[PDB]
Structure 1
Amino acid sequence: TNTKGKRRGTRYMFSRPFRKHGVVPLATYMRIYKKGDIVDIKGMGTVQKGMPHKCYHGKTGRVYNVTQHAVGIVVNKQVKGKILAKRINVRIEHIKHSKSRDSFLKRVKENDQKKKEAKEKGTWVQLKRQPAPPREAHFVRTNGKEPELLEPIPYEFMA
C-alpha cells in the first residue's frame, strides 16, 4: 500500500513556480477577508505554517472564521458517496479571493441598472443570460475575385 503521510505527492503541488521563489509579495498579507467571502485554496510552499491539506489544494470555500494570521474556511471535500462541508484553518498565503462570484455581483448590479431604468419607461429589457444562439442569416460577399480552390497535397516522406 501507499505511504500515508500529510505531504505525499506534493513534490510539484506545494512547490513554487519557476523564478517565483523567495520573499512572498506583501499584497498577499494585506487583503481583507470577511465572513461569507468565497476564497480559493492554493498551498504556497514558502510558508510551512498553517498550510491546507493537499486534498483542499485547488478547492474553493467560503470564510466563517477570521483570526490574526488565518481564516477558517468551509470547503466541500467529498469522501466516497458523501460530500462533507468541512472547516479548515488556513493561513492567508495559501488563499486568494475567488473572481468566480465577482462576475455575478457585477451582473446583479448590472440587472439593477437595467431594471430601475425602464421600470416606468416600459422597454422590457432581457435580464437572463440567453445561451449562444444559432447565428442569424447573413450575406457573405465575394468582392469580385473568386474563392481560392484548395486540393489535397501529394505525399512525400520527410525524414
Structure 2
Amino acid sequence: TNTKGKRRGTRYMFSRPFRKHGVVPLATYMRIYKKGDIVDIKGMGTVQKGMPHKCYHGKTGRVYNVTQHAVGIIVNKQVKGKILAKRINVRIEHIKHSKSRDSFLKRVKENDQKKKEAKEKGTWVQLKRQPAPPREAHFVRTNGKEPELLEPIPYEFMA
C-alpha cells in the first residue's frame, strides 16, 4: 500500500505556475472575507502555514469564522458514501472569492429593479431563465451565387 503522508501526490497541485514564483502579490492579502460568503480553496506552496489538505483543493465552501490571518470554512467532503460538512481553517493566501455567487447576486438586483420598472410602466417582463430554444424559421439568401460544390479528396500516402 502507499503512505498516509499529508502531501503525498501534491507535486503539481501545490507548485507555483510557470514564471509566477516569488513574492505573493499583495492584493490577495487585501481581499476582505465576511461571514457567510463563498470561497474557492486552492493551496499555494509558497506559503506553508495554514495550508489546506489536498482533498479540499478545488473545493468550494462558505466562511463561518474570520481570524487575523485565516478563515474558517464549512466545506462538503464525500467520505465512502456520505457527505459531511467539515470545518477547516485556511490562511488567506490559499483562498479567493467565488465568482458564481457574485453573478447570482447581480441577477437578483436586475430582477428586483425590473419588477419595479414593470410595475411602474404597467408591463410584464420575463424574469426566469430559459434553456436555448429551437432555432426559429428564417430565410437564407444566395445573393445570386451558387453554393460551392464540395467533394471528398483522393487519398495520398504522405511520409
Common fold, TM-score beyond 0.5?
yes
Task: For residues 65-124 of structure 1, give each alpha carbon's deviation from its aligned partner in whole angstroms, at most 9, with x where no partner exists.
Answer: 000000001000110110001100000000010001111101000101210111142211
Other structure's SS at 1:34 match: coil
Distance across 2 between alignment mates of 1:50 and 1:39: 15
Aligned runs of 1:80-159 on 2, under 5 Å? 80-159=80-159
User: Scaled by the length of structure 2, what TM-score is found?
Assistant: 0.98
Question: For structure 1, which segment, 117-126 or 27-36, has the greater mean C-alpha deviation from structure 2 after superposition?
Answer: 117-126
Distance across 1 between alignment mates of 2:110 and 2:118: 13
1:59 is displaced (CA, Å) by 0.4
Distance across 1 between alignment mates of 2:115 and 2:67: 40
Other structure's SS at 2:83 match: strand
1:153 is displaced (CA, Å) by 0.5
Distance across 2 between alignment mates of 1:27 and 1:44: 15
Please name the residue that 2:37 is paired with: 37
Moved over 3 A (4+): none
Distance across 2 between alignment mates of 1:25 and 1:75: 26
Please name the residue that 1:59 is paired with: 59
Task: For residues 33-87 of structure 1, give each alpha carbon's deviation from its aligned partner in whole angstroms, at most 9, with x where no partner exists.
Answer: 0001100000000000000000000000000000000000100011011000110
Distance across 2 between alignment mates of 1:46 and 1:120: 55
Identity percentage of aligned residues: 99
Q: In the alignment, does 2:46 pair up with 1:46?
A: yes
Distance across 2 between alignment mates of 1:42 and 1:15: 11
Distance across 1 between alignment mates of 2:157 and 2:114: 62
Question: For structure 1, which segment, 143-152 or 114-123, has the greater mean C-alpha deviation from structure 2 after superposition?
Answer: 114-123
Distance across 1 between alignment mates of 2:97 and 2:155: 54
Distance across 2 between alignment mates of 1:124 and 1:97: 35
1:2 is displaced (CA, Å) by 1.0
Other structure's SS at 1:140 match: coil
